[PDB]
Amino acid sequence: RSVASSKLWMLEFSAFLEQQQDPDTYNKHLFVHIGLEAVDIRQIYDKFPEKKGGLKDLFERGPSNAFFLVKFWADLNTNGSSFYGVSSQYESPENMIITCSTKVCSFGKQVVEKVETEYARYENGHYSYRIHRSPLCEYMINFIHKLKHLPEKYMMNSVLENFTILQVVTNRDTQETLLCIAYVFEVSASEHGAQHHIYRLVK
């Protein structure tokens, strides 16, 4: 359990493109997937929204054990019959109503936000939450299109330097930060496809 505070653990996260070849045949490509060294949070504050409710405000309010930075190397090697989606799964000892707020940022400015409410399912003494095949927003689809249509790989990384995602998972009733994950991106150059490093964010 890497991405885990005291109250919530993210077991699974992936962004994918699923293509329907025919009614019985589907090809799925994963862009990124999950399924701890410390980083000075001050080194990344500029890459994320500021002011009240922003990364700094959230981190200062705590708890500090809820804050993570994920570095993704994204696999972009993939080709009206397409679905761009994201799936994620969480476990908790507690039965909560949680809100998952995902912000896409460019040069630290919020460009789009997706907000999702999730209820618990009892599963083996604990509770599971699943965001199943959430449609990827058009901005993200468009961003991926533009990325792949850049001449050179070095250009993709130059664009990605200033593209981040902030995911904040909150107890809806109490507004306690259960998980806050900052996502940073490079393009995968590896023969093993998508990779990742997970860090604890510290003061």
Next chain:
Amino acid sequence: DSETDLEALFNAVMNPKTANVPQTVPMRLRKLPDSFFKPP
């Protein structure tokens, strides 16, 4: 003043002569762990 929109973002990299996006410290030049740029 600089722009911060989708076309401007890619334009800045495709045609650097006409770039008008905020300027930043490259991640490689920041105080970050070595593993940050060495994938597994």
